[PDB]
Design a binder for this molecule. Structure first.
Ligand SMILES: [Zn+2]
Ligand SMILES: [Zn+2]
Ligand SMILES: [Zn+2]
Length: 252
């Protein structure tokens, strides 16, 4: 499979070559900002290039929120992100599952996700990514993902499995791919991250492979079971070696 990394938005093609990455993932803007993504002077060059570029949508998007002042801007920035991703010829857009405010509102959160998807304008595919923390999430625990998918599974939405998030959620990595695919039928992208924290911590602190607490063989096995392209979302200095390790261990 293609193996790469999450890189700075500044010069994805140079970063990919420096890291030995076959694919990269970027944010278009500040990951934590509500400002619309800005057009890039290099858009035509990125669109023409062969390197696949995945776009991570801003972290504050919460399509499940009951708060109109969150939900409505979330839909708008997701629309803008998909348009900006198409402008650079991106492979896909990744968006986190989001959350509600309290456990009683989970089912309504699924319906808000469906409503957002019923209005989404995109020329590039969108993947939902699982999340790490205890937050009344739509997509932290796999039991919740199963209930979510009963509502949104027919929309065409894809799925990105993040191994650090899975670990932080308390889900076992040994059969995570099998369990997710029994629900979604699909894993379109893997974020292959070690974690600085113990299993089930609910914290999201990525680590270079082997620098954290997840046995690297569990990560390799998950990558092989999924078969999908891989993004290492790990610290800059160790990232070339992370990619090279996975490449060698998967026969890529
Ligand atoms: Zn993410
Ligand atoms: Zn991730
Ligand atoms: Zn994370």
């Amino acid at each position: 499979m293609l193996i790469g990394s999450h890189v700075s938005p500044t010069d994805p093609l140079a970063a990919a070559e420096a890291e030995g990455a076959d694919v990269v993932q970027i944010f278009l803007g500040n990951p934590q900002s509500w400002k619309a993504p800005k057009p890039r002077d290099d858009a035509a060059a990125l669109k023409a290039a062969t390197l696949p570029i995945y776009v991570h949508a801003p972290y504050l998007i919460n399509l499940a929120s009951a708060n109109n002042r969150v939900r409505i801007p979330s839909r708008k920035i997701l629309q803008e992100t998909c348009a900006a991703a198409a402008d650079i010829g991106a492979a896909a857009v990744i968006v986190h599952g989001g959350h509600v405010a309290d456990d009683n509102d989970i089912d309504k959160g699924f319906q808000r996700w469906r409503k957002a998807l019923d209005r989404l304008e995109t020329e590039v595919p969108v993947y939902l990514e699982n999340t790490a923390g205890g937050d009344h999430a739509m997509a932290r625990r796999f039991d919740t993902i199963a209930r979510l998918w009963d509502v949104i599974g027919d929309t065409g939405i894809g799925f990105c499995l993040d191994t650090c998030h899975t670990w932080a959620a308390g889900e076992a990595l040994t059969d995570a791919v099998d369990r997710i695919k029994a629900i979604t039928g699909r894993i379109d992208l893997v974020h292959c991250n070690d974690s600085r924290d113990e299993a089930g911590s609910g914290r999201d602190r990525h680590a270079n492979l082997g620098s954290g607490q997840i046995d690297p063989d569990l990560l390799v096995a998950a990558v092989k079971a999924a078969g999908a392209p891989v993004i290492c979302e790990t610290a800059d200095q160790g990232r070339k070696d992370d990619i090279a390790f996975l490449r060698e261990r998967t026969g890529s």
